[PDB]
Design an enzyme around this catalytic site. Structure first.
Site, PDB file in Angstrom:
ATOM      1  N   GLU A 188       0.822  -1.208   0.000  1.00 46.60           N
ATOM      2  CA  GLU A 188       0.000   0.000   0.000  1.00 46.60           C
ATOM      3  C   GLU A 188       0.861   1.265   0.000  1.00 46.60           C
ATOM      4  OE1 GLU A 188      -3.102   0.447  -0.425  1.00 46.60           O
ATOM      5  OE2 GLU A 188      -3.949  -1.594  -0.214  1.00 46.60           O
ATOM      6  N   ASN A 200      -7.445   9.678  -6.013  1.00 39.87           N
ATOM      7  CA  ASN A 200      -8.288   8.762  -6.774  1.00 39.87           C
ATOM      8  C   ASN A 200      -9.262   9.506  -7.687  1.00 39.87           C
ATOM      9  OD1 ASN A 200      -7.367   6.292  -5.408  1.00 39.87           O
ATOM     10  ND2 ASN A 200      -8.413   7.194  -3.636  1.00 39.87           N
ATOM     11  N   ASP A 227     -12.422   9.381  -7.898  1.00 46.56           N
ATOM     12  CA  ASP A 227     -13.656   9.853  -7.271  1.00 46.56           C
ATOM     13  C   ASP A 227     -13.463  11.098  -6.411  1.00 46.56           C
ATOM     14  OD1 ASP A 227     -12.447   8.795  -5.031  1.00 46.56           O
ATOM     15  OD2 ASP A 227     -14.162   7.547  -4.432  1.00 46.56           O
ATOM     16  N   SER A 231     -11.448  11.277  -3.838  1.00 44.73           N
ATOM     17  CA  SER A 231     -10.874  10.880  -2.570  1.00 44.73           C
ATOM     18  C   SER A 231      -9.359  10.752  -2.689  1.00 44.73           C
ATOM     19  CB  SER A 231     -11.475   9.551  -2.113  1.00 44.73           C
ATOM     20  OG  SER A 231     -11.013   8.458  -2.893  1.00 44.73           O
ATOM     21  N   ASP A 239      -6.125   8.437  -0.590  1.00 46.79           N
ATOM     22  CA  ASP A 239      -5.715   7.419   0.363  1.00 46.79           C
ATOM     23  C   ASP A 239      -4.505   7.924   1.143  1.00 46.79           C
ATOM     24  OD1 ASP A 239      -7.679   5.718  -0.759  1.00 46.79           O
ATOM     25  OD2 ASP A 239      -6.246   4.900  -2.166  1.00 46.79           O
ATOM     26  N   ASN A 256      -8.832   5.526   3.067  1.00 42.00           N
ATOM     27  CA  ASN A 256      -9.549   6.315   2.072  1.00 42.00           C
ATOM     28  C   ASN A 256     -10.436   7.400   2.689  1.00 42.00           C
ATOM     29  OD1 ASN A 256     -12.289   6.419   0.186  1.00 42.00           O
ATOM     30  ND2 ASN A 256     -10.364   6.364  -0.964  1.00 42.00           N
ATOM     31  N   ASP A 274     -15.772  -4.143   9.338  1.00 41.08           N
ATOM     32  CA  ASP A 274     -16.981  -3.643   8.703  1.00 41.08           C
ATOM     33  C   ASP A 274     -17.731  -4.698   7.899  1.00 41.08           C
ATOM     34  OD1 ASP A 274     -18.694  -1.288   8.183  1.00 41.08           O
ATOM     35  OD2 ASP A 274     -18.063  -1.584   6.100  1.00 41.08           O
TER      36      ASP A 274
END
Ligand SMILES: [Cl-]
Length: 127
Positions: A35, A46, A48, A50, A52, A59, A101
């Site tokens: 990562e 990203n 969208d 966003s 990271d 995110n 989650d």
């Protein structure tokens, strides 16, 4: 900071990640390698809108708040800026929420593609 492999393994173990929600420590070390290359300040934008953040590339659409991401949910209740600390506490605490989650470590694309299915305990061998 840039962690060494065993250095990060030891810190992650102190922070309770070994076997957390079914994921042995090597999973977490491998995830961090792919990562962020073990750099606590890694960031990646990203499509969208966003970004990271940090050692575990958390995110800003779902998990941390960076104030510039449409559709933010801030489910870790943490500013993304805290996730760029050289101290891994905030990133670990949020990772524990993420992995709880309902979809395991699949939240981490690099883990899914480059760690899952390999012998991840190699990442803590020698430590
Ligand atoms: Cl090996």
């Amino acid at each position: 900071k840039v962690f060494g492999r065993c250095e990060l393994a030891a810190a992650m173990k102190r922070h309770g990640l070994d076997n957390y929600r079914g994921y042995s420590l090597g999973n977490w070390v491998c995830a961090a390698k792919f990562e962020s290359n073990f750099n606590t300040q890694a960031t990646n934008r990203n499509t969208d809108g966003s970004t990271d953040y940090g050692i575990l590339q958390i995110n800003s659409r779902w998990w941390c708040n960076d104030g510039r991401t449409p559709g933010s949910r801030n489910l870790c209740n943490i500013p993304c800026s805290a996730l760029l600390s050289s101290d891994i506490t905030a990133s670990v605490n949020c990772a524990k929420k993420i992995v709880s989650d309902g979809n395991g470590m699949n939240a981490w694309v690099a883990w899914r593609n480059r760690c899952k299915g390999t012998d991840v305990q190699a990442w803590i061998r020698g430590c």
